[PDB]
Amino acid sequence: PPKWKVKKQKLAEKAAREAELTAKKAQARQALSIYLNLPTLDEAVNTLKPWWPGLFDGDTPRLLACGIRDVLLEDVAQRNIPLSHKKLRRAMKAITRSESYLCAMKAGACRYDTEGYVTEHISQEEEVYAAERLDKIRRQNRIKAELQAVLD
Known part of the structure; x- marks a missing residue:
């Protein structure tokens, strides 16, 4: 499709990966909590x-x-x-x-x-x-x- 259309799509995908990654790290952080009590x-x-x-x-x-x-x-x-x-x-x-x-x-x-x-x-x-x-x-x-x- 158009170019502005593709640049906006690629920027959205990039934002997704970066939001996803930040999401699993936050999840790993919460799960790790109990193992850091000592x-x-x-x-x-x-x-x-x-x-x-x-x-x-x-x-x-x-x-x-x-x-x-x-x-x-x-x-x-x-x-x-x-x-x-x-x-x-x-x-x-x-x-x-x-x-x-x-x-x-x-x-x-x-x-x-x-x-x-x-x-x-x-x-x-x-x-x-x-x-x-x-x-x-x-x-x-x-x-x-x-x-x-x-x-x-």
Whole structure:
């Protein structure tokens, strides 16, 4: 058909693609929301490592002594460390739910306290638990990686 007619059509198509794309990114954003409720592993490690370096081998979190949160809370107040119970709790969750931490939970593996003492050994029941959580965590991770790529 005419030229002004074609130029207006091509401009509409271009606007469509650009509105469509912006639409799926907004959708990916909303879907990703639930997967970003906890701090990232790097953020979690950086929250705890400065105060309790014994809990880390380099940047890698060691398996944590049972009930250690209560000890960390006590230490935060004695040292007047700027860290709320909530932020402590969230960083610990990000760590114990990471693939690396879950992979380390094998029968006979050691849990450590802040001074480097072994407090418990991982049981067969904890190993079964970890393998199953790992199965779901990886699925969640693949979903958020895909969604993030939509955004990138």
